[PDB]
Amino acid sequence: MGLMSKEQLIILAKNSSPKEGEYKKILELLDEYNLLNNSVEKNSIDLYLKLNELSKSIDIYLKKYKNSKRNNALYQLKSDLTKEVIEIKDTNLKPLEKNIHFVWVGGMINNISIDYINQWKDINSDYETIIWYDSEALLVNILKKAIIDSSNKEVLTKYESVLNDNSFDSNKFYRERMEVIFRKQKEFNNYYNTNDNYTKSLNDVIKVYLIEKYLKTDEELEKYINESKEVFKANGAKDIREYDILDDVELKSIYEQELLMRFNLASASDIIRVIVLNKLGGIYLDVDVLPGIKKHIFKDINKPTNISENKWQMIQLETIMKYKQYIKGYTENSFKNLPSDLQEMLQEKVVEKNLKSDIFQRLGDIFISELDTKIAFMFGKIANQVLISKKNSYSLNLIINQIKNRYNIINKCLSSAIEKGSNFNNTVDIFIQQLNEFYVNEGFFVSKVMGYLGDGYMPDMRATLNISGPGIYTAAYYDLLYFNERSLNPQILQEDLKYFEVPQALISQQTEQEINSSWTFNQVKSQIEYKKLVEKYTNKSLSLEHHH
């Protein structure tokens, strides 16, 4: 079923007055949509654009004749347009390109990640599995760590005689450290643009800079580079510098601003995964996501009442790995603490299965609309750890426009702030000032991006989420469902988002590497990390008690 017919709307909206010109436009647009929906081609994108026309046509009538008796039928039709978008998205399916995309930029990929990736390769021989990396950025993590470690040492040496004084605390440490980090980020980019270094190979530039200013040896860095490239080539990885991934001059600059001025590798990967999925299609996966476990394996075992569903999945993965050894070295700590009769029931359900494909669910043939882009949910929230989309999808285009618009705003106020700012703290203050003065309409957005310059270095700042992360996907889905562009304050409910969910049957998210990497740089973890930093870099040790 689709939209109401034109004669159906005529009967619902009839009154004694003649048809207004704006009403006739709605009616002919409705006719055009319904004729479009009954054709051989039925192209999802062409149908969506016609709905967008219809939506703008209803808004024109509703604002010109705000008391018309037709408005009740017309508002109903307007509501139906959003429901119709969902129906097109889920019935005009085309086969998904059989690509599995992983992204690892900034350094060497971990060997356990290769093990996880290989589980996906084995189960989906009909898919091409690609590990995307950046051959020019293999030293970025080393540079970032060198910048952070020298800023730790610099601050802790400057305040060593006051670390146990009353005024100095962990929050003062991170504020003073952020000034040093900002300065050092500034130092590198000055070197990056000195003479002709901006046209030399980025990897060579970073290597020389690390030798020159951070006491690295050419031998040890060359070894890291070549050994990482060896792992990548041994697993059929693809360099983004060689497959025209960085075609878009705007997106390339955004990628490299995250890569080289914020050293925010999570954000840099947020960019690349969107670019490769839009260019080639398929499914993107974080390297710590494993295939889904088939529903019927453990169905007859009762989950203990206290144990969460996420911990139940951990136990299932641990059971599989303990008795099938698909990934060697997988933890069994959760399994070991279970009562022995539950261990024995879990073990039996695994040992009775013969094939790895009998336990894990293969991707198989996936059908999806050109309008769609699916996203994983974790704890009821959308997370871009898994994405599914055809190439050049309509929703990926909306997501790309969200990135470009958001970085346009951020960079316009960051450049203003850097010009007017004398240090890190007043640069941030001017940044926030400029954001509020010129985006008075968007206070929800300004609140989410305030801490851009401190993200990853300061406790309780994660602006990235609403610039390159899941926050832009919420906005893009609102753009699609309610016929808007580049919206910064979406009004979309938890129900509308779940029409975009990656089927849970396809993924196991509660893996050992996922849980290890899952963290939150909040106040308490910052205080723990600061406490260890003091003992590492000085001979003092943090008091537990405050002296009166």
Q: Which residue has the tokens 């050419």?
A: 218
Is 276 in contact with 376 (CB distance < 8 Å)?
A: no
Indicate the SS3 state at residue 35. helix
282-285 and 381-389 as β-strands: parallel, antiparallel, unpaired?
A: antiparallel
Q: Which residue has the tokens 């346009």?
A: 408
CB atoms within 10 A of CB 4: 18
Bridge-partner residues for 129, per DSSP? 100
Right CATH for 293-359 from 3.30.1050.10, 1.10.10.1780, 1.20.58.220, 3.40.190.10: 1.10.10.1780
DSSP 59-77: HHHHHHSTT-TTHHHHHHH
Each as own residue / partner, the long-range contacts of residues 294-301 (CB below 8 Å, 24 or more positions apart, any chain) are: 294/358, 294/359, 294/360, 294/361, 295/505, 297/349, 297/350, 297/353, 297/359, 298/346, 298/349, 300/349, 301/342, 301/345, 301/346, 301/349
Indicate the SS3 state at residue 320. helix
How far apart, in whole angstroms, are the C-alpha atoms of residue 89 and residue 92? 6
Retrieve residue 30's tokens: 């409705």
How far apart, in whole angstroms, are the C-alpha atoms of residue 486 and residue 61? 24
Which string of b and e fits 221-248 if b means at least 16 CB within 10 Å?
beebbeebbebbeebebbebeeeebbeb
Query: Residues before each break in the chain (C–N > 2.5 Å)?
Result: none
128-133 and 238-239 as β-strands: parallel, antiparallel, unpaired?
A: parallel
* Start and end residues for every CATH 1.10.10.1780 domain found in the chain: 293-359
CB atoms within 10 A of CB 478: 20
367-368 and 94-95 as β-strands: parallel, antiparallel, unpaired?
A: antiparallel
Indicate the SS3 state at residue 301. coil
How far apart, in whole angstroms, are the C-alpha atoms of residue 188 and residue 523? 29
How far apart, in whole angstroms, are the C-alpha atoms of residue 312 and residue 287? 21
Query: Residue 295 corresponds to which amino acid?
Result: K
How far apart, in whole angstroms, are the C-alpha atoms of residue 117 and residue 267? 21
* Start and end residues for every CATH 1.20.58.1190 domain found in the chain: 6-92
Structure determined via: X-ray
Cα distance between the two ends of the chain? 75
Phi, psi of 358, deg, nearest 5: -80, -20
How far apart, in whole angstroms, are the C-alpha atoms of residue 476 and residue 312? 33
Contacts of 137 (CB under 8 A, 6+ apart): 105, 106, 202, 203, 259
| Distance, C-alpha 60 to centroid of its chain | 36
How far apart, in whole angstroms, are the C-alpha atoms of residue 91 and residue 57? 25
How far apart, in whole angstroms, are the C-alpha atoms of residue 202 and residue 453? 23
Indicate the SS3 state at residue 63. helix
How far apart, in whole angstroms, are the C-alpha atoms of residue 383 and residue 377? 6
For CA atoms 21, 26, 29, 34, the dihedral sign is negative
Is 100 in contact with 126 (CB distance < 8 Å)?
A: no
- 6-92: CATH topology is Methane Monooxygenase Hydroxylase; Chain G, domain 1 (1.20.58)
Indicate the SS3 state at residue 346. helix
How far apart, in whole angstroms, are the C-alpha atoms of residue 74 and residue 52? 15
* DSSP tag of 306: T
Is 184 in contact with 147 (CB distance < 8 Å)?
A: yes
DSSP 173-237: HHHHHHHHHHHHHHHHHHHHTSTTTTTS-HHHHHHHHHHHHS---HHHHHHHHHHHHHHHHHTT-
How far apart, in whole angstroms, are the C-alpha atoms of residue 231 and residue 233? 6
Bridge-partner residues for 290, per DSSP? 508
Is 184 in contact with 150 (CB distance < 8 Å)?
A: yes
In degrees, to the nearest 5, what angle opens at C-alpha 48 toward C-alphas 47 and 52?
A: 120
Residues in the chain: 548
What CATH number should be reported for the domain whose range is 99-285? 1.10.3730.30
Is 499 in contact with 89 (CB distance < 8 Å)?
A: yes
Q: Which H or E run includes 100?
A: strand 99-103
How far apart, in whole angstroms, are the C-alpha atoms of residue 346 and residue 316? 8
How far apart, in whole angstroms, are the C-alpha atoms of residue 167 and residue 159? 11
Is 206 in contact with 147 (CB distance < 8 Å)?
A: no
How far apart, in whole angstroms, are the C-alpha atoms of residue 359 and residue 130? 24
Is 512 in contact with 450 (CB distance < 8 Å)?
A: no
How far apart, in whole angstroms, are the C-alpha atoms of residue 26 and residue 349? 60
